[PDB]
């Protein structure tokens, strides 16, 4: 029963291993093994549930174990394993073949097979752990082993993509352990984790690997947000080491998602408004990407309210995600109408929902945006309006309070008006008629630049996928 179960899944694993083994042996091809590893995550996740855990036991017995003898026993100890007589030395799939990792030349140490075998061995370990959701000692045991192993290897061009997906599980398993239980050792463990990310990122700068630095920057920028150091994130993004060429669309959307949150506290919403929009277009619309589109759209609605301009309300009702957008619907209504008591009562009941995403602190500063937007609305109504009539519509305190708020927004060019005290009304200084000025000409220049940029980007990849058609013999 259990004998035929281990031979079926192991044969499917070796079949996928021999495909990427011959591709890296001849010259250097990094494109083909990368496309297979994309589907490997989905095929292995479903396969780990079937045929239990016994598919990975004979794989370690097959190939030679540099470090991997005692690591599988520690993984099988937590599950209280019953003895099936799985002791190594029973099943032998090598049988002295060149593609089978010939044993005599391997045992004599005349050839080194450990490079591709050991780096691939650590990949299947983190996949089974993420399926069973194992924590505590098993998480710390892997972090201690992997770090010296990556420092010993020279990390060639093909070797940089093997551990590129392993760093994601290092930071993921550390955050799930802290949120599950808080202790004194969780803080000291994060100190070493910060130094490990920076040492490997600096080494990857010489190799100039596109996917390696893409996964690290996404994990490092998120670490600064949890640890709460802004000065580290400000200088980190100033170097601009993130390549835009071969990185995946899923990795690009995560990059622009962090820049919108960093610039949110810098009081510059001009550049932050573009990063949150570009992150939506780069993120897929599929079901697995719904988790990112849910959090990204919650930030976009908050940025527009911080800009003093009411965004388009059609995004809430037309989308199918409005169930989670209900708290943000009443926030825009309170800022637009300018009701003072409605805004205070909205953030009070929904404070629990806004605590998880940490957007409640930004809602505290929306209290100012309620009045600043209302002043902009009433200013665009009538060019000449009395001073005391403003306090009657918004139910303000006195005329001395509104006098400062109108002259406050004109510093950034918001209201664009003047207050006449001797006359008794506030006259708007905006006559429009910009058709005679040069201001629209500056915007028209940047629009054509976007056209010539896409034309050059159209030339980036055109003939490239067709380059292999001429060299390969056709009919």
């Amino acid at each position: 029963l259990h004998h035929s179960e281990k031979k079926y899944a192991e044969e499917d694993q070796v079949q996928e291993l021999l495909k990427v083994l011959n591709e890296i042996s001849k010259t250097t091809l990094t494109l083909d093994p990368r496309y297979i590893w994309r589907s490997l995550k989905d095929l292995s996740s479903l396969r780990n549930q079937e045929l239990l855990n016994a598919e990975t036991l004979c794989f370690t017995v097959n190939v030679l174990y540099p470090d991997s003898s005692s690591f599988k026993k520690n993984l099988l100890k937590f599950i209280t394993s019953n003895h099936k007589s799985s002791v190594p030395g029973s099943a032998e799939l090598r049988n002295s073949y060149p593609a089978s990792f010939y044993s005599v030349n391997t045992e004599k140490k005349t050839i080194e097979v450990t490079a591709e075998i050991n780096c691939f061995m650590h990949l299947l370990v983190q996949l089974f752990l993420w399926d069973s959701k194992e924590l505590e000692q098993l998480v710390e045991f892997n972090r201690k082993v992997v770090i010296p192993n990556l420092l010993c290897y020279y990390n060639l061009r093909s070797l940089n993509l093997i551990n590129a997906k392993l760093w994601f599980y290092i930071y993921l398993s550390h955050e799930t352990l802290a949120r599950s239980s808080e202790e004194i050792n969780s803080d000291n463990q994060n100190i070493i984790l910060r130094s490990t990310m920076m040492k490997f990122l600096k080494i990857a700068s010489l190799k100039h690997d596109n996917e390696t630095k893409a996964m690290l920057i996404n994990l490092i920028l998120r670490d600064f947000l949890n640890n709460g150091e802004v000065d580290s994130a400000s200088d980190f993004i100033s170097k601009l080491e993130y390549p835009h060429t071969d990185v995946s669309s899923s990795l690009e959307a995560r990059y622009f998602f962090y820049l919108s949150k960093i610039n949110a506290i810098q009081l510059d919403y001009s550049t932050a408004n573009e990063y949150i929009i570009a992150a939506i277009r780069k993120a897929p619309h599929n079901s697995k990407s719904l988790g990112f589109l849910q959090q990204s759209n919650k930030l976009h609605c908050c940025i527009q309210l911080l800009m003093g301009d009411i965004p388009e309300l059609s995004f809430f009702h037309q989308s199918n995600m409005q169930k989670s957008l209900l708290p943000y619907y009443h926030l825009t209504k309170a800022v637009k109408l300018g009701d003072l008591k409605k805004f205070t009562s909205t953030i009070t009941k929904y404070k629990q929902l806004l605590l998880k995403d940490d957007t409640y602190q930004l809602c505290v500063r929306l209290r100012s945006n309620v009045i600043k937007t209302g002043i902009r609305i009433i200013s665009l109504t009538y060019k000449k309006i009395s001073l005391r009539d403003i306090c009657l519509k918004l139910n303000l305190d006195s005329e001395q309070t509104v006098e400062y708020m109108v002259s406050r927004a004109i510093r950034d060019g918001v209201i664009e008006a003047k207050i006449n005290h001797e006359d008794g009304f506030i006259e708007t200084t905006e006559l429009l008629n910009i058709y005679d000025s040069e201001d629209p000409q500056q915007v028209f220049d940047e629009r054509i630049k976007f056209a010539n940029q896409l034309h050059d980007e159209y030339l980036v990849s055109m003939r490239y996928p067709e380059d292999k058609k001429t060299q390969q013999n056709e009919k």
Binding site: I191, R194, S195, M198, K199, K202, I203, S205, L206, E229, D231, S232, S234, D235, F236, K239, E241
Partner: protein, 155 residues
């Protein structure tokens, strides 16, 4: 962890405080290099001081400032001022790089000065600091018994 408390002690006058504050930066680098770039003018100010004898450790950290930012032009100059503070046998990511970067600067400066005179290696025209680090890798190749890289690097 911020570099402000460790770099704030360099503005006073003491023998032990300047030493303890400087050695703390050499231990923790990859974490604190964000705020060190802004304090770099305060670090390079002690290098020109003749009464400051720790400049070997100060220039070693100042070399890591541009080394972490991607600029290898100034990272080689300040690294040579470390003298015994820079270990050849450490074989770390910083040692195996700056030494390799000094080899590239040795080739570019030799070919440009070869047309004027062929004796530049004997005279003082060439930087003698780049020559000392260049001969250390020569003896390193002799221990591995390789005559291709030993005679090939001098060509």
């Amino acid at each position: 962890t911020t570099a402000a408390p460790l770099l704030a002690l360099l503005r006073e006058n003491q023998d032990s405080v300047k030493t303890y504050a400087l050695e703390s930066i050499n231990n923790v680098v990859d974490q604190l290099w964000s705020e060190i770039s802004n304090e770099l003018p305060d670090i390079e100010a002690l290098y020109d001081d003749d009464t400051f004898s720790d400049r070997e450790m100060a220039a070693l950290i100042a070399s890591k400032v541009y080394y972490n930012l991607g600029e290898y032009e100034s990272a080689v100059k300040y690294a040579l001022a470390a003298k015994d503070r820079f270990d050849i046998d450490e074989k770390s990511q910083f040692v195996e790089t700056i030494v390799s970067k000094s080899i590239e600067m040795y080739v570019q400066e030799a070919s440009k000065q070869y047309t004027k005179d062929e004796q530049f290696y004997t005279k003082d025209i060439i930087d003698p600091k780049l020559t000392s680090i260049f001969e250390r890798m020569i003896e390193k190749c002799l221990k591995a018994s390789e005559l291709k890289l030993a005679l090939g690097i001098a060509l």
